[PDB]
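Technical annex B. To support the medicinal chemistry partners, we prepared a structural model of the target in complex with ribulose-1,5-diphosphate, based solely on the information shown next.
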Amino acid sequence: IVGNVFGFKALRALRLEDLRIPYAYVKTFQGPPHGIQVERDKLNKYGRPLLGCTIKPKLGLSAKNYGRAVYECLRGGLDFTKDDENVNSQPFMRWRDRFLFCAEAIYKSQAETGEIKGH
Amino acid sequence: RSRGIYFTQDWVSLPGVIPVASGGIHVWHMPALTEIFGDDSVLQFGGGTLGHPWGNAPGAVANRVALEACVQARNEGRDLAREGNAIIREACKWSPELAAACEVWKEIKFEF
Amino acid sequence: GFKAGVKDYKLTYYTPDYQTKDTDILAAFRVTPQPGVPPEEAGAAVAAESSTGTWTTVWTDGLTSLDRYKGRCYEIEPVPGEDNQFIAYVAYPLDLFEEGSVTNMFTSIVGNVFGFKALRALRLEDLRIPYAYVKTFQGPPHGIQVERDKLNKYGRPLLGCTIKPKLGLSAKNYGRAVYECLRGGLDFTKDDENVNSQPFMRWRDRFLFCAEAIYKSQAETGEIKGH
Amino acid sequence: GFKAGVKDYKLTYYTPDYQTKDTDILAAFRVTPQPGVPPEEAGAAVAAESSTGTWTTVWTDGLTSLDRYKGRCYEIEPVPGEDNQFIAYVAYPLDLFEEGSVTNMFTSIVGNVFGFKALRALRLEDLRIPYAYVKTFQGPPHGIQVERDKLNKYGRPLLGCTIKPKLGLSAKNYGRAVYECLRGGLDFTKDDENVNSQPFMRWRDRFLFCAEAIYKSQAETGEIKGHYLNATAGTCEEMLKRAVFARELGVPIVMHDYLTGGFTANTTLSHYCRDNGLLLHIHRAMHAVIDRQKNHGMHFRVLAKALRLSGGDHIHAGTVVGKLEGEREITLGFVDLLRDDYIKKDRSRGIYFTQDWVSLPGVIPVASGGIHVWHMPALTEIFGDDSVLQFGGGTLGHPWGNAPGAVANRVALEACVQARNEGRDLAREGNAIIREACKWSPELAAACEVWKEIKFEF
Amino acid sequence: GFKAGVKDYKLTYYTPDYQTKDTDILAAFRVTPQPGVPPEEAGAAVAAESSTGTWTTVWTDGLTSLDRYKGRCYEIEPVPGEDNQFIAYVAYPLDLFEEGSVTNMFTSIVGNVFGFKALRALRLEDLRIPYAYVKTFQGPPHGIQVERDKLNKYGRPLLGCTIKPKLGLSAKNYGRAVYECLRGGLDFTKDDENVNSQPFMRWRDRFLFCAEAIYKSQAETGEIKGHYLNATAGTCEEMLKRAVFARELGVPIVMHDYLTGGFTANTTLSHYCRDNGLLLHIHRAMHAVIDRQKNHGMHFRVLAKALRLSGGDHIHAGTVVGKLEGEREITLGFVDLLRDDYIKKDRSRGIYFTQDWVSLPGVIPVASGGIHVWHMPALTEIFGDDSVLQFGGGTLGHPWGNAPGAVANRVALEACVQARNEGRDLAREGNAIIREACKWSPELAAACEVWKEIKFEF
Amino acid sequence: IVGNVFGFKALRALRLEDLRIPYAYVKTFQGPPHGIQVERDKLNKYGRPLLGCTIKPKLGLSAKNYGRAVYECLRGGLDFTKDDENVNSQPFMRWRDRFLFCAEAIYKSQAETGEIKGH
Amino acid sequence: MQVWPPIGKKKFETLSYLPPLTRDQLLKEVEYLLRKGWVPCLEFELKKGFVYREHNKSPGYYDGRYWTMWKLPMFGTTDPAQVLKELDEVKKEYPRAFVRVIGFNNVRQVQCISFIAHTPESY
Amino acid sequence: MQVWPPIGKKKFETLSYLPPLTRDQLLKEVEYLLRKGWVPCLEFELKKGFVYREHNKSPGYYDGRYWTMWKLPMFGTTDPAQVLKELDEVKKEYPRAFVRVIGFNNVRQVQCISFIAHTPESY
Ligand SMILES: O=C(COP(=O)(O)O)[C@H](O)[C@H](O)COP(=O)(O)O
Ligand SMILES: O=C(COP(=O)(O)O)[C@H](O)[C@H](O)COP(=O)(O)O
Ligand SMILES: O=C(COP(=O)(O)O)[C@H](O)[C@H](O)COP(=O)(O)O
């Protein structure tokens, strides 16, 4: 559907607005791992929008400050915190570290509030 | 087509995605937000939280309350877009966490 | 000392005085800003949102070193028209990037910034990959030299033919076309982009009839054959 | 056009006009040539044999680009005496080296050249690791910052004690010593270099009695506790068998001597420790064999750059005032090379090259070698907080035992830090800071009497 | 009675009356002590610090038996010339050492005792490995026996050639060059030590193009052919990735640099070599750093024994004549140790102890280093038949090229064999068996004109 | 059945002569991997006894000389050769080595006799 | 600058960040549920009032997620009166106990609101 | 020969083996912290002022390491005075908390100093 037809020299510009996926194709898909239903029932959270917060600055936080920051945000009322999109594994802060310090913080805020928490 | 919806789409029980709103939002956005996405949504505040004068725990509290304050008001039968700016002022009264954040992001509007 | 609130981007992320480093990834954005939006700001806007920055002051910036890690906009170049289009030159440090990871590099310099309501539009033209960054990459598994040694082909451009119709052919029909092709003198045949494995033709049957056909013609022509 | 036969080295491999590139590995050899052998030649001899060259003309050189790939000697520096010793500066291109591979880098710049009949002798002093090369390395699995976060330890040097006797103790007897040690106030205990698994004590029994003892004292002191578990081994399979069990006990830390194990064995280990969350402790067992002499060898400083990229959380670094040798200025040099991000050419400490590490984690220097309580302001002035200082005898030679030996050390360490923090000069008041801290600490005072006259000074 | 305090090493470690057990490990250290440290004190310092002692007294000595376990300096030989270098005899009980591991054995014996501030210089001349320890080792993957029978090659020295230039050849030129050298008469070709996997030439490529060439030359000549493939790598994953592929390619030999590679990885490599029948060649890359000097380091002998134990098919063994150092008698000594089941004491040869190997396979020594067609008979007389003679320069530098250079050496080798067998003397009538041989080979004769008057003498 | 009864003090000597293997228990076993009929159809020999020979000396022969005698044995007309009970893997000859020469030697005396051989 | 408490501030999900709900408000939520078409259901807990993990700990497995059910969900029910009526009765027998009001949507088969109605005295 | 007690010796990292410092010394540690361009912040805890492991146990993992943040790191503080002011303050809100004075390096981005500044009373 989009492999080449958009570079077509016999046009000025092309854009794909909508795609109708038949339902017999849709059925060769698992799709979402969980869906809006399971997500809510796993976490026990109902009747409101969920709340998160993306940690700042995008980059340049070290793992230990990541987690003190998560702990902070999760405890004061947020259902979720989060890594920025650019946050992956870099010199300033390697992934595994982040994961461990962040898991601690997850579970410390969860005790603190009695609310289910997810970084 | 008013919505840019070209075809009819049937999903045959495939799970839904929860949409995530996120991007220069703050405590004052909260009711426009609740009215647009509804309950099935994830509302996301980095600036909105990591930039509250009191810090992260509070910024959290500010948004969590201002969210809640919306929910109940809609449920009680208030209109969120006509009476939005107020459910928040009424809410500034009980949260010192909230009220602080509305003074700092008093008159930031993302409009172009 | 930490003061809550919105400030301009230009103050931290526009440094016309900056001297790029050999370690910096160097971005070249062709920017069409909104009415009102000055060069320096929409320029800075760009470097902040693609790196460390945010739409308000956040306190954790104090915890780390902005100077060590912010993407800067270091040069704006005026571009013909009005429009008021321009070329904004952005330096992101090494430290911002996952080693060996196009994925981290594109998420970041191109994750979000193109969606700023505050531009009409925005194009990434070119990126100076600093070499210290290259070195973290395997890149091609062989490369130009190595391919030629392995096939033993030298002195001329190489020759391929993608099979048609793009879709709708059988596994056996494929390598029929592939054999008649390769034997006539093509270095390669190919699968069209579109073909992977479908109802009309499951891959492994394809892979099979192609290989029978890769070789029947290699030994016929005395020439190394691919598909 | 190809002509068969011997020519001088100097003609292709001596380019005094060359401008080093930021991609070049920059070698600093202290060369003592034979009688007759000119500078330029023995200089060139060196770069050829460590890179692309050969003792005769070979034709295949025509097949490739010498200019693109030869190590060159670009500078000779005269050195005091006759002798006729000198410093020959060698640039090898990037392209010559396996990415991420100390092993390829040392094989090559140091494979063969030291055996030239045509020198009396030869020493590798320093190597400019170009950053584009650094970037191909994981290096330490955590680094200075990360270790401190994980243990939660801040503001002071760290404290270890290698257990004794080096050899001959039981598994159960080990972690007896380890527990009485850790509870008295040590951040760490360790396996001696020598202990791996022997007749008197098979490792996994050790690992077991140590862990029971790691934790009984953590919960007693309210303080995070380690014991260096040595993975160091015969084969690579065993070596991995040992840190797995460690991974599995919950234990913060493992050890490996990197040079008798080898940089290959070491790199696998620093790779596994990052993937499994293990601190890596390095002994430099067997070094002084390589590093002791002024005219021939490899300066410790190469051996410490090379460990930094192979990878490790801690490396022994010398004691200065100890039983093992290591002079002050030279020692201050390689501690910043282990530690810092950028290190400026410093000839008086022996840094021959500006060294940039462009964000590689730092390794914490470990001090350890016949030191005790009175050396502790020398230690806290010499290293700075950013160090493990380590007390074998200095803890199990304390008269009242292990929990008191350990106390004596922690307070005297604390005392120096309060004293420093408050504006006092550790070179000029430390003896008195110790005397002071004795009135308040009976354990300290005891270890002060046994060791009131023991120096090591040649 | 635990008495705290510093005591003389001599009290527990010096034991002039000790009778050694057929199971100890014995060491001969060439000690040059500082000024005003008595022989006996430096001897025991050396013996304690490599075994069980430390610098002050520890009470955990009482939990075990120091008698059972301590290292003992059991003799002091006052030494010729040097004032006042002596030779210290130390005995290490079997129980000290872990089964199957050179690393451990090199960790206690050389871990620190060489950086000792109370000495001027230390060097490890000889190590007597008991035969009950030797028996915890696989050793060589194959040995001189199996190697010969696998390849079907008998009655002469083996022949190789190291490809040049060291670095900078691309994979495709590597293989055309191997093909060339293997077809014209060589049993073996080889990668240089530095050849591992780099930008100019990635390992896998090299392996494939080189396997082809192996098998093309083998058909061409009817002789069994073996190119040496470097598995030396940054990580044992990578070292193991390469032998697996060499495995799959079906080719007879691989290479490892053991000292840079290092011992854990090396004995891992030998295990995979005896488990999948790969013969394994060794390079001693860096050896010179440690063995080169007379006063301080480790003699090549000690590292020769280490290799036997860890495993290796071939080990480099110096050329005597060629461009890098190594002297005959001594060079004679260490060959019987890599090769024989039994070497009696023989001090004329630098053979400190009697060494029994209890059937452990022998290593084939490899001569290699500025050798050429004229060296060939000195060579045959020194090493004998059980040896691998290696010519890169010697071949890749013949005026006619690689096939011929091969032919020149192959004939000049052969020409030696027969003459010795016929009853000629190779060192008195050496230069002639070659001139007589120049008469029938135009390949040979050409090479003697080009390397007419190159002599490596210093 | 043979665990302790041979040690009773009240006994001077006990020998187990035979064991009735009830058919019910037989069935939980696989027994021989191929058995007589099946061996014979693989090796393709009928009508006579098979012929074998154990390599001599018991122990002490090398991987090559084993295979050299293994070829000289098969070719001249044995259906089998064979390692002696004590041949296993030793400092005089390691197994992976015997196995590999002995296999050259089986197939070579195969192509030479046109009978099937083994060792 | 107000420091938020790290104890004494345990929460109950949707609505627990506002002041506790008055009976005009506990009514007004019940009406919404009914105005939307949900079915209301009351649940309660006497033991551990927040979330823990005793019996397993793998991802998204939690404990204390379930409470005990008060009777049957209220199919039939049109008045919000009759709900708080049940809330009165469940307090009146379990005063040392957490009570939650929930409501289902039967098409989607999820809980669409849930909010605390009653606590012990302090927790 | 004296016995170091196996109970009742709970410690708090740097300085905790020294006699408790007077305010003169407490201000002196702050002055050092400010003099080397670090940035002071106060942390505190009420439940669990030692490390344990409940929520996982793998190498490198511990719980209790994070305390709660007292407001914000003091960016732009110059006069060691201002640190004590906040210290006293947390003491008044929580006499029975554990309180640490911690100094941030922003370049190295690790805590360059961390010493305990108040205990409750009983344990
Ligand atoms: O990182 C941010 C900005 O954070 P904040 O404004 O909260 O500082 C964004 O939320 C998303 O990554 C942008 O993507 P999208 O435009 O889809 O949300
Ligand atoms: O065993 C000791 C001495 O112990 P102590 O002096 O504590 O009894 C040391 O920790 C290292 O062997 C020193 O070598 P390096 O210079 O390599 O650290
Ligand atoms: O690379 C060469 C020189 O080759 P050529 O002289 O044949 O060009 C050497 O043979 C060995 O690597 C040196 O090591 P050692 O000194 O043990 O042999």
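Notes passed to the chemistry partners:
The longest helix of chain G spans residues 23-36.
The pocket of ribulose-1,5-diphosphate (ligand 1) is lined by residues A 54, 84-85; B 22-24, 44-48; C 54-55, 112, 115 (CB under 6 Å).
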